[PDB]
Write a protein that binds this ligand. Sequence first.
Ligand SMILES: [Zn+2]
Ligand SMILES: [Zn+2]
Ligand SMILES: [Zn+2]
Ligand SMILES: [Zn+2]
Ligand SMILES: [Zn+2]
Ligand SMILES: [Zn+2]
Lengths: 73, 73
Amino acid sequence: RLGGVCGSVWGQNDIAYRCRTCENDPTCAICVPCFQNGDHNSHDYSIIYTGGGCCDCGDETAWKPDGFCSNHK
Amino acid sequence: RLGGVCGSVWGQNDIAYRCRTCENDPTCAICVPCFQNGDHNSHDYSIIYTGGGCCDCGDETAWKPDGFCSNHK
Ligand SMILES: [Zn+2]
Ligand SMILES: [Zn+2]
Ligand SMILES: [Zn+2]
Ligand SMILES: [Zn+2]
Ligand SMILES: [Zn+2]
Ligand SMILES: [Zn+2]
């Protein structure tokens, strides 16, 4: 749609996705909804327990733009 | 907050949560964000691959109200 960082926040035991294909570094992650609304077919992703943090979807300094979901580009 | 069913939709391989403590029946489920914004401490929950469907959070006919998240009550 016509045009934002997600920034959604995790608590200590909340799950999220690591995507090693899309991450800027190994400390980056995206929330489940952002994962599900993007294209990670064939990517090396895993479900992780975050230990807290915030979603990097839409932040080009933490996540590769081709890994953004449909709501954060 | 002052006051809705979530209704968020899953694709075939999308994950969600089953909560056997909160479900109306074994076919009910809630989305990850709704799980994370509710209280399922001590509940018998699991991450599942949905096969598609929609989130039951906020629908008293599919999910026990004490299992609703903060955005759907
Ligand atoms: Zn996100
Ligand atoms: Zn996103
Ligand atoms: Zn990816
Ligand atoms: Zn939901
Ligand atoms: Zn909810
Ligand atoms: Zn529950």
